[PDB]
Amino acid sequence: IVGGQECKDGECPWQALLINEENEGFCGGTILSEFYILTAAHCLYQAKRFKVRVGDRNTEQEEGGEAVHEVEVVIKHNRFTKETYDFDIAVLRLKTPITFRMNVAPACLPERDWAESTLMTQKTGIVSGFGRTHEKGRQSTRLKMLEVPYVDRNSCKLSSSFIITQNMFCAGYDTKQEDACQGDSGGPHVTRFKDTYFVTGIVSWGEGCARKGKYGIYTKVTAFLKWIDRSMKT
Amino acid sequence: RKLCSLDNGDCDQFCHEEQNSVVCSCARGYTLADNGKACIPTGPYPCGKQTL
Ligand SMILES: COc1cccc(Cn2c(C(=O)NC3CCN(C(C)C)CC3)cc3ccccc32)c1
Ligand SMILES: [Ca+2]
Numbered sequence: 067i068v069g070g071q072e073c074k075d076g077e078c079p080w081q082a083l084l085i086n087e088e089n090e091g092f093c094g095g096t097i098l099s100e101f102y103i104l105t106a107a108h109c110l111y112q113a114k115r116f117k118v119r120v121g122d123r124n125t126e127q128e129e130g131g132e133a134v135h136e137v138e139v140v141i142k143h144n145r146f147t148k149e150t151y152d153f154d155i156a157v158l159r160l161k162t163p164i165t166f167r168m169n170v171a172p173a174c175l176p177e178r179d180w181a182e183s184t185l186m187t188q189k190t191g192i193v194s195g196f197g198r199t200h201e202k203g204r205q206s207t208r209l210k211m212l213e214v215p216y217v218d219r220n221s222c223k224l225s226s227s228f229i230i231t232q233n234m235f236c237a238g239y240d241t242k243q244e245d246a247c248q249g250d251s252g253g254p255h256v257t258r259f260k261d262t263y264f265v266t267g268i269v270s271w272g273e274g275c276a277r278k279g280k281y282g283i284y285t286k287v288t289a290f291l292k293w294i295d296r297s298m299k300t
Numbered sequence: 301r302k303l304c305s306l307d308n309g310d311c312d313q314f315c316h317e318e319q320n321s322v323v324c325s326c327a328r329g330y331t332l333a334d335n336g337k338a339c340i341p342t343g344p345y346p347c348g349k350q351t352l
Contacts, residue, residue: 076351166345174327174348180314184304260312262339262348264327 067195068276069244070212073123078194078211079166080173080254080263082120085134086113091125091205094195094253095158096265097172100165102298103158105252106268106285107146110156118160121170123209125196131169136161141297143290152231154270154285156252157297173256175295176264181288185257185266190215191237192256193269193282197249201275205249212246214238214255217281225279233289234270236281246282247275255284312339 073081082095082103093109095118103118121131139159146153164170176185194211198204214237222236230236237255238245246253246269255267267284274280287294301307303322304315311324312333326332326339329346333339341349 074352079350168351171345171349171351172347176327177314177316177325180316184308184315256348259308262313262327263350264348 067193067197067206067210067212067250068199068201068247069242070210073194073209073211075123076168078209078254079121079169079171080256081194081209082118083122083196084109084113084116084252085119086116091119091196092116092249093251094197094269096254096256096268097164097170098175098265098294099172099298100163101160103160104265104268104287104294105156105158106154106270107142107156108148108151108154108270109252110140110142111148118158120164121167123169125207129169131167133165133170135164143293150229150231151271152233154233155268155287155290157294173254173263173265175291176266176288178288178291181264181266181291185259185264186216186235186288188216188257188259191266192258192263193237193246193250193253193267193284195246195250195253195269197251197253198247198275201247201277212244214244214246214282222281225281226283227273230283233286234283235267235286237267237284238282239276240281241278243276245272245276247272310337312337
């Protein structure tokens with residue numbers, strides 16, 4: 067995350083962190099329930115084998131609520147393609163259930179119709195992660211969050227050098243130096259509504275980070291809700 | 301601005317229209333309240349709640 071603030075105690079409990087064999091975080095994820103993690107499909111090729119850490123806000127200092135979980139099932143959308151990053155979504159089934167607590171809780175899955183006309187019509191969404199604080203910088207050791215305005219779909223397409231499919235949406239600023247970045251992929255994009263947070267996106271990609279005239283590209287969760295429920299049902 | 305378009309129909313969460321009228325509902329872990337609008341949690345850790 068470039069700019070924004072750090073997630074304070076109990077502020078971003080649905081945040082999950084995918085870590086490799088060397089316990090390095092390479093991507094984020096969102097807790098959907100005690101057994102399921104929502105992330106990006108393109109994160110799956112980052113490591114040949116990874117685990118899932120929850121309740122972590124400082125990669126170098128155990129707060130006592132941390133907990134590693136092994137992945138039992140990786141459910142990737144068969145239509146995902148590295149050529150365009152379309153259908154950049156995957157669900158992870160954990161071997162052992164997550165224990166909810168102060169910094170560990172699930173985000174809510176909304177209904178499609180309501181999410182698009184009410185959640186995505188709000189002015190801002192919240193993105194978070196342990197990603198880079200600057201485009202060419204290194205990974206953050208502190209979990210960060212950033213409020214990001216929903217971008218008009220027309221402005222989105224006109225600003226992108228790459229195709230923006232119907233499974234993606236733009237969020238962020240035109241010139242302000244705040245945006246998600248490398249390492250945040252697969253992380254949560256949630257929208258607040260009356261004190262309740264709903265999953266609305268998955269950090270996907272972007273042209274650089276916080277660049278002028280460029281926005282953060284997120285997987286449109288509402289387009290996969292039925293798919294997500296199916297992956298969790300079995 | 302009518303029904304759900306006017307302040308989410310006074311619903312705490314999901315709002316949908318079926319026959320010129322509002323019907324509210326809630327996410328898993330919540331139950332619609334007596335007023336048929338608010339969403340009451342069912343456990344110690346309902347979804348979407350921060351604990352500051
Ligand atoms: C705004 O938030 C984010 C979140 C995650 C990553 C980024 C930007 N980003 C990307 C990237 O994304 N490449 C895309 C190019 C275009 N392709 C498309 C053509 C599919 C996808 C990879 C690679 C990369 C390397 C170092 C720093 C930032 C980076 C920005
Ligand atoms: Ca820690």
